[PDB]
Amino acid sequence: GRSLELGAADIQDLESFEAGRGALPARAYLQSDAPRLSLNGEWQFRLSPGSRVAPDDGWQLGEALNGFESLPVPSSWPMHGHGAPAYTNVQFPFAVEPPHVPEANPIGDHLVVFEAGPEFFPHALLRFDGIESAGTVWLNGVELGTTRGSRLAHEFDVSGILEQGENTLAVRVAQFSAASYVEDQDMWWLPGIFRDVTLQARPAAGIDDVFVHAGYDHITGEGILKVEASRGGQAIDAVVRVPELALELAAGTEVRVPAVEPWSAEVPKLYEAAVSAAGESVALQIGFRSIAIEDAQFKVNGRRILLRGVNRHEHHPRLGRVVPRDVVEAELRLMKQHNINAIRTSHYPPHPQFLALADQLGFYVVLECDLETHGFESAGWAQNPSDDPQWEDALVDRMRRTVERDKNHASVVMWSLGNQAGTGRNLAAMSRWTKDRDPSRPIHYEGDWSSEHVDVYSRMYASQAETALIGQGIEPALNDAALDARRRAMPFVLCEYVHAMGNGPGGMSEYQALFEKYPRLMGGFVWEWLEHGITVSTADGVDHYGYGGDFGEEVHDGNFVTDGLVDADRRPRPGLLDFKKVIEPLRIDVARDWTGFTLRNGQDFADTSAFSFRYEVEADGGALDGGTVDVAPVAPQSETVVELPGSVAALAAGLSDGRPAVLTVRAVLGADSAWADAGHEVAWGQSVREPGAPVPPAPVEPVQVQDSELTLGPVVFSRATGMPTSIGGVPVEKLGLTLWWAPTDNDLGREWGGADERPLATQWKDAGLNRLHTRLLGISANPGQDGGETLTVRTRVSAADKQYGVLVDYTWSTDGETVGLRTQVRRDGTWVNRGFEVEWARIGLEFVLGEETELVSWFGQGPHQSYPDTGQGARAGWFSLPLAKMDVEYVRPQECGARSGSRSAALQLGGRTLEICGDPFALTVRPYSQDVLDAAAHRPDLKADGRTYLYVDHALRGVGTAACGPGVLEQYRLKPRDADFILTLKVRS
Amino acid sequence: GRSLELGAADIQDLESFEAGRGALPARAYLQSDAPRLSLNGEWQFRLSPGSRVAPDDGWQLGEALNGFESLPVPSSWPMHGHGAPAYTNVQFPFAVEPPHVPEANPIGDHLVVFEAGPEFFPHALLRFDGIESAGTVWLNGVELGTTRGSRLAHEFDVSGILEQGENTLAVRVAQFSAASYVEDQDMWWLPGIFRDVTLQARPAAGIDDVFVHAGYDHITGEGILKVEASRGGQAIDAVVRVPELALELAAGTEVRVPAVEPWSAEVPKLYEAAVSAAGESVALQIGFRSIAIEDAQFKVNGRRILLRGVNRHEHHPRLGRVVPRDVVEAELRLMKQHNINAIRTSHYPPHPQFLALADQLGFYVVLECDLETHGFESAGWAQNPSDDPQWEDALVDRMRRTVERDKNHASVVMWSLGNQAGTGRNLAAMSRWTKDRDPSRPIHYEGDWSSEHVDVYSRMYASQAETALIGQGIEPALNDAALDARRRAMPFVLCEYVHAMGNGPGGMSEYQALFEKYPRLMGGFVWEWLEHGITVSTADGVDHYGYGGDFGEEVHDGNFVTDGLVDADRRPRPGLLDFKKVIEPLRIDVARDWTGFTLRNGQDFADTSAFSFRYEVEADGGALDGGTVDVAPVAPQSETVVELPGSVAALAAGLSDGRPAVLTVRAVLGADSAWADAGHEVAWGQSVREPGAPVPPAPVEPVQVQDSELTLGPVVFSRATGMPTSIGGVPVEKLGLTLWWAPTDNDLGREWGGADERPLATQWKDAGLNRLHTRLLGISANPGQDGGETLTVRTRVSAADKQYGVLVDYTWSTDGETVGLRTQVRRDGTWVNRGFEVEWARIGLEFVLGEETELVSWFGQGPHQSYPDTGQGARAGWFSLPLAKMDVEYVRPQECGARSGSRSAALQLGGRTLEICGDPFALTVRPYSQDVLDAAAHRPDLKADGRTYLYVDHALRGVGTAACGPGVLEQYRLKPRDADFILTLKVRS
Numbered sequence A, B: 001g002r003s004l005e006l007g008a009a010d011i012q013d014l015e016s017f018e019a020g021r022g023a024l025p026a027r028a029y030l031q032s033d034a035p036r037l038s039l040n041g042e043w044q045f046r047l048s049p050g051s052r053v054a055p056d057d058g059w060q061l062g063e064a065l066n067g068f069e070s071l072p073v074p075s076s077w078p079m080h081g082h083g084a085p086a087y088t089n090v091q092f093p094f095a096v097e098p099p100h101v102p103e104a105n106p107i108g109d110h111l112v113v114f115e116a117g118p119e120f121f122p123h124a125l126l127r128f129d130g131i132e133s134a135g136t137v138w139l140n141g142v143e144l145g146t147t148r149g150s151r152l153a154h155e156f157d158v159s160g161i162l163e164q165g166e167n168t169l170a171v172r173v174a175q176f177s178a179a180s181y182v183e184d185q186d187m188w189w190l191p192g193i194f195r196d197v198t199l200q201a202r203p204a205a206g207i208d209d210v211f212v213h214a215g216y217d218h219i220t221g222e223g224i225l226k227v228e229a230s231r232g233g234q235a236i237d238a239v240v241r242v243p244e245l246a247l248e249l250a251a252g253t254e255v256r257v258p259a260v261e262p263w264s265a266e267v268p269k270l271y272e273a274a275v276s277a278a279g280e281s282v283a284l285q286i287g288f289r290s291i292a293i294e295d296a297q298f299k300v301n302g303r304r305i306l307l308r309g310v311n312r313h314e315h316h317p318r319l320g321r322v323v324p325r326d327v328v329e330a331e332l333r334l335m336k337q338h339n340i341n342a343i344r345t346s347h348y349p350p351h352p353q354f355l356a357l358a359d360q361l362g363f364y365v366v367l368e369c370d371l372e373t374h375g376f377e378s379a380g381w382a383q384n385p386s387d388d389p390q391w392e393d394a395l396v397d398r399m400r401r402t403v404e405r406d407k408n409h410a411s412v413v414m415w416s417l418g419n420q421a422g423t424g425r426n427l428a429a430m431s432r433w434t435k436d437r438d439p440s441r442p443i444h445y446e447g448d449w450s451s452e453h454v455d456v457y458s459r460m461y462a463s464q465a466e467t468a469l470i471g472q473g474i475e476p477a478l479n480d481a482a483l484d485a486r487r488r489a490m491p492f493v494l495c496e497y498v499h500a501m502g503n504g505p506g507g508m509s510e511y512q513a514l515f516e517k518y519p520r521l522m523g524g525f526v527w528e529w530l531e532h533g534i535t536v537s538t539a540d541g542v543d544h545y546g547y548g549g550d551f552g553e554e555v556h557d558g559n560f561v562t563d564g565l566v567d568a569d570r571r572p573r574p575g576l577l578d579f580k581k582v583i584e585p586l587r588i589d590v591a592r593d594w595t596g597f598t599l600r601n602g603q604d605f606a607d608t609s610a611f612s613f614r615y616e617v618e619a620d621g622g623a624l625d626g627g628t629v630d631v632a633p634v635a636p637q638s639e640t641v642v643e644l645p646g647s648v649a650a651l652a653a654g655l656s657d658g659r660p661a662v663l664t665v666r667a668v669l670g671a672d673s674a675w676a677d678a679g680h681e682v683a684w685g686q687s688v689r690e691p692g693a694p695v696p697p698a699p700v701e702p703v704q705v706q707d708s709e710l711t712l713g714p715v716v717f718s719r720a721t722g723m724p725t726s727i728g729g730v731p732v733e734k735l736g737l738t739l740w741w742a743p744t745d746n747d748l749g750r751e752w753g754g755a756d757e758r759p760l761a762t763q764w765k766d767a768g769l770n771r772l773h774t775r776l777l778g779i780s781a782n783p784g785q786d787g788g789e790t791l792t793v794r795t796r797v798s799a800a801d802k803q804y805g806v807l808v809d810y811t812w813s814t815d816g817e818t819v820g821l822r823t824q825v826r827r828d829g830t831w832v833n834r835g836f837e838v839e840w841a842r843i844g845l846e847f848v849l850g851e852e853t854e855l856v857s858w859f860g861q862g863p864h865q866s867y868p869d870t871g872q873g874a875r876a877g878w879f880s881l882p883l884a885k886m887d888v889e890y891v892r893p894q895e896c897g898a899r900s901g902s903r904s905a906a907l908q909l910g911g912r913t914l915e916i917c918g919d920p921f922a923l924t925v926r927p928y929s930q931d932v933l934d935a936a937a938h939r940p941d942l943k944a945d946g947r948t949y950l951y952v953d954h955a956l957r958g959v960g961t962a963a964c965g966p967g968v969l970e971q972y973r974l975k976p977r978d979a980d981f982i983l984t985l986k987v988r989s
């Protein structure tokens, strides 16, 4: 019988295994003097829910358009009300049956009219720098071809189709195609024409492609230069001029430049150059650098380098995959400002303009092909395109287009085949093609741990332990002896580590120490630079970020796309402030006696001449002394001891005993750089003179006894509960032990190994730690001093249906002015539940006060939060913040804002000030409870209730990176234990 | 130092291990001619949140009451706005640290004033029939004592405290006490004075206690009677008169009555008797029956009996543990009306009035002591009161009070020590005490499987398989040979089985067949008789039942308290209608040729004389013939063949081929009984003449082809989807394959064994069965008949991120009037996910129609729902119900309402009628979707949306009892398979 289904031809094309058709050969993105017209601007746009209903009503001609409306191009069209963004991590949002597409497949028809002057005749082309995921292109009704590879460029010859004067460009874009099966990155699904559309003239006697080869001989200091140039795939006569180096040479010939200044992330020297034929001239920036693997080390210009990296996705909270150039420039500057020297273009090539910026500002770039088949893993990689011969031409095309576009840029030091694509024949074909085309850059691919077709050994989230074994070259052998010998001769990189989701990442210091210790370790790139939050508005008008599930998705992965060091608007998370310190390229170790500091230059090429070294002594009453010291330039990987001026040490010796003072030595930029202004801080170190342990008040005040209340100086206790009801007129609504915090994203992840793979958050829930109850055992007053007395309140804390508990005794004392509080915790019974030992989040106290707090001040670490395995960037000092600024605006609210290492604190409750001192404690202050914080899925869910929630912790657990990778390291875990700790409280009015 | 805590003495008493103090000896509940005054009525009531704040302001005197308000007594005070009900199953709602109580412990002070006339002097007492959980009692300010054992009676001597005229009774009731640790039944926590308070005169020369011994000699037919009577614990002279039996005997002497009619559940003969002393007379109902264990069988009056039981809690949706007498009488009648003959007073003694009702209506009762320590299990039974010597006197007291109150009632055939209390020394002490006090009744206790201190082997939810092994006496041996020999000589009872929560219970038939086959098997009691729903009202005014979590509980167990055969208002669930049939005490097997039926009397004592045997033949057009047949009385456990009148068979032979007709034979009550009216149906059986397989219409109509639509007779298809868009003018919004249903309570429970302990609901979720997607592969028309043609639509069904699917082909045909639909399902790829084979709920079609349905009619099984392992009570016939009555009002909405075995159906959509015929299918019709049904937590969440959701299933899974006990039995599971099935559709206007 005859077929009756609609749209079968459009679908057959969408299900095609082949690369796009009709396109010109893949080439570099080149700055040319050839006439060009950007077609970016307001286009017309019509959306159809599938191919079988996509009109074939002659719309490509642009006449009588039924159903079209304005839409900007470039755009991600779900960012403008056409459908909605959808987020999955691994899972595909359609049935997995390659190459077939779902019936529900948004089809976006795009149309623009433009004018072509005589500059574009006879020869011109149209260039598309990105279409997600399948484009069909018509000009004046003539089909030019199709596009596959959503983050790759395509060019179409319009010679003889372009007409002088008015032209009509039509583009039909399907969201889903066969290509969606190889584009399963962890990120928002976002169809659209999301990068530039450009009309370019191709004058006769021009230059189609250029391949810059600029090597460096670190022994002689010579440059090795060869600039290839071709037209229609054939080498051509062109002249290469490099004025700064007094060079004029033919394209195609290799020359030795007697002396060049080499390119690196640290010193990104670029030489302006032009290669020109009679009809066209291309402008280049040349950076001389050679990449080599030697002695299981990754070396640039003869030196092993340390990669201080991030994984950079392209995302904008309002424009989707369209990242405006000012945002790119700003965020790259922000990276440099936080000591980052390396970028991985996770997991596709960036906008083509990114490359010159990376060359100029100075990043080591891992340029990664647009390939990811992650969603096939859950079926044992059955049907994985990476090993399906039918996909070979498509996957080689992706790699070719990746390599050809960006091959001229000194910042690209590695090519990556893709990400999470399994192992297979087509990856090997992509590697072979790349090695043959460009042997000057090592190949990276983490998916095949045997490393058969790569030049570096790459892993993601390997533990600190396993990294140390790899750093020593003693990891376990591959079964294949030949492959094992190859892999052991390779240097090692963490292409993703210390997953930066929510509160965290913990354990960054432990990785860094290994990076510094073992040459084989190349460093690592944090997952990831940014959170992919998408801005959402309410009638109230407040903005908050949305994540998976906030846009109607049938299947999604929640907030796992908000997992970055900065939010979608590039506002730093605390983890970035900590990261900056962890990777700081100079180490400053200030001497205890304040006579000087040790300075190690951790850079690979530059000396310390770019830095001004500054000291300041701060005390309770502000700065006491400061200035600048002269440091003879210290060579890379060398060390010296710098003397501080004698006045500094004399100041230290003069300090009254127990008077706190902090000496800070800082390395700042001596002059404006391309990425920050003079005075910008790069590295720092401190020495602290600690305040004495606070003296307990003499217990000279007696306890008044009344029917329902007890008074001990400024504290009033409920006789029924034994807990304070006010202190110095400040109402206390509750006081109790805390063992729990509102789970972080990490606490919601499974820690693998052991028989227990409940997330820590679930272990806590099962154990009842979020719902502690207190039983009063007794209240007793005891002889103090000179008629005074102490008050002891004996309690037991546990939870419904549990037999384990802790005995908590509070001992109060007062001389009338200061209140002394001693807390003793003792385990009662075995803290085991569901067959596994219960771990605690904390050993602390929660004070719930019946008034709001306007200001929080403290002496300790800051200004930002710190937990046991974080806070590297929190320095010692005196800090003061309004209550709102004590919080951290994670998209999904969670435990955050603790200030570990606090020696004193002051809360301002209107006209009263509550002071807390004692041996070091963590400080947290919130206008809402832990139960409201845990329940809240988005920041608007957090409502202040008129109270102050004050947390004083004697011990905290670490935060780890268990959402993906290692959990809390052993030294930072918190198993049930006995404890005791002392505090002092005072209210001033 | 000196103590300052408040309320320490009240708390010390609450934490006491001892039974109550001050009470009179435990005795029977006896009907006496002694003056009595019920103090039930409106009392005054004040609530305090804990003992440390409970005022000691002299309120016991009743003068100047500060803070008291009216409250009825008896009451569960959280049922009247004082606090709230709270539901936990196993978990305790307080920290487990016996004997200690939480600080948050509702204290309810109760006060009443009453008048005592000279009838109550010199001697009187106050009787309390239940206080949850700890009472302290004052009369005119004089403390009488305390109460422990919340469902047990306590009596206090008021002689010399009661004053003539006005008296003031004060009762302080704590919700929680040490006793809460032994009262952890799965049920609502409900403090209050929840049963009668009675002032009773104790005239001199009276009778305090009576112990009736009324045995039966089934060989001679003699009664063996001895009636003990005592005053102050000493036997006394009393006269026992039994007029009906011409007896006058002294209390304390055993006599042989020459002939008595024995008592049983079937024939609950009772003889009125009075035992009287000079000062007092007690009225008894005596039932002569002896209980004996012989040949591993539980026998009454010389015969092994079959228990057809339920577990009966005491609950009322508005009054809590207060069950009004009219509700008791009504529900016991409803039980008899559903063939129930046995009750287990789960898990405490009932109201004392229950016992006479059970004697009179006729139930075999397992009278169970108020003891349950279930919450200690999760700690390995550490600190279990059942094995703690400090709790021995408290636990023996509970058993003593249980036994003494109810020992005179013939309906009590077993004493139970308690429930879910572990094993231990104090249970053994309770058993020893009981055996010594009353050797006439076997002891039951499931908690100790070794059965060391019991006389029957009791289990709960043993599988059908394990029950069959136990029935054959081949279960595995106990390690202790002596205990194994004892246990193998015991009969076996399921004290709880076929958990009746939500849709279900499945697998009842398989248990019953074993009960009938194996004498050792005593039968079983369903868990449980009623749902504990608590009525909740909204401003709208609709009522719905609340369950755990609906009342603010910090910890709770959700709808696990709504797990019954009837709802809280005693409205039957379908499971009750099925249960009634499963346990029917006569079996009627109607002959295929309609000449007669086989009749087996399944009763243990009665013959069939109480029944009238009626036949009716029904056809499409109603009743055709009917009448009554005379059956010579058939003895218990005998069998006969009854001839039907010749006209019946002649009617069968005369039927036109393929014309449906149902012969039903019924056993109804020939006369009013005490529990139902004449004509009440007890047993039934059917023989069906099936309609022919419906003829497929001749495919003589062609398919019209248009741009966006196809027409094939009355069906209009969307050319883009291939699915029907209307049939005979009825709009079709969607048509697709179904494999999933909204999980039942059972589907949410874990099926133990295997490596997969995900609940089936979770397996489905993980597999994507709730979110199927369909891809169109092709649409084709093919040669039919006489220019007609068939239309085939080829699809594939799968779900996002899955590689497995099914190929579904629809083949449509029409002669213009009827529509023929053939559906073919074929597995594509292996249906495995997370390492385990995916199971299906169904193989069906969902039609979503764009109009509402008012009426649903069908020929099949009904009227109520039926699933493969249920529907025993759905009989063959013609049924017709409004749409709302097709649903089942489970408290948590869930899959329900399917009518399996349907041969034809008619949906009325206004003025059009949609008819569906074909080989047997299940029918379901709803005004809302499956996703709305699954999301709904309470019935108000179900909103109609203007559509009709029609489900036609070719195969269904069973429902099992996996919420607690066996899941779906193997024969009723539904693994992925290929399938094909035919339907016919027709619309009449």
Ligand SMILES: OC[C@H]1O[C@@H](O[C@H]2[C@H](O)[C@@H](O)[C@H](O)O[C@@H]2CO)[C@H](O)[C@@H](O)[C@H]1O
Binding pocket: A089, A090, A185, A186, A346, A347, A419, A420, A460, A461, A496, A527, A560, A563, A964
């Ligand atoms: O934010 C996650 C991050 O993960 C990398 O790979 C992870 C993956 O997230 C996780 O789902 C799987 O279980 O483990 C992998 C590594 O162990 C991805 O490469 C990255 O793009 C992100 O998706």
Ligand SMILES: OC[C@H]1O[C@@H](O)[C@H](O)[C@@H](O)[C@H]1O
Binding pocket: A265, A266, A335, A336, A337, A338, A339, A340, A341, A342, A362, A585, A682
């Ligand atoms: O000032 C030293 C600099 O070294 C670069 O390699 C790095 O990218 C910069 O962020 C900064 O740390």
Ligand SMILES: OC[C@H]1O[C@@H](O)[C@H](O)[C@@H](O)[C@H]1O
Binding pocket: A423, A447, A448, A449, A450
């Ligand atoms: O390439 C081999 C590797 O493949 C990964 O996908 C897998 O998680 C590792 O266990 C390792 O076997």
Ligand SMILES: OC[C@H]1O[C@@H](O)[C@H](O)[C@@H](O)[C@H]1O
Binding pocket: B423, B447, B448, B449, B450
């Ligand atoms: O009494 C012994 C029994 O105790 C139960 O609590 C337990 O679940 C059974 O496995 C059996 O060992």
Ligand code: NA
Binding pocket: A088, A089, A090, A091, A183, A184, A185, A186, A187
């Ligand atoms: Na994805």
Ligand code: NA
Binding pocket: A089, A186, A560, A561, A562, A563
């Ligand atoms: Na992510």
Ligand code: NA
Binding pocket: A740, A741, A742, A743, A894, A895, A896, A930, A933
């Ligand atoms: Na918290």
Ligand code: NA
Binding pocket: A742, A892, A893, A894, A933, A934, A935, A936, A937
């Ligand atoms: Na939260």
Ligand code: NA
Binding pocket: B088, B089, B090, B091, B183, B184, B185, B186, B187
């Ligand atoms: Na309970």
Ligand code: NA
Binding pocket: B089, B186, B560, B561, B562, B563
């Ligand atoms: Na229950």
Ligand code: NA
Binding pocket: B740, B741, B742, B743, B894, B895, B896, B930, B933
């Ligand atoms: Na359903």
Ligand code: NA
Binding pocket: B742, B892, B893, B894, B933, B934, B935, B936, B937
């Ligand atoms: Na539901």
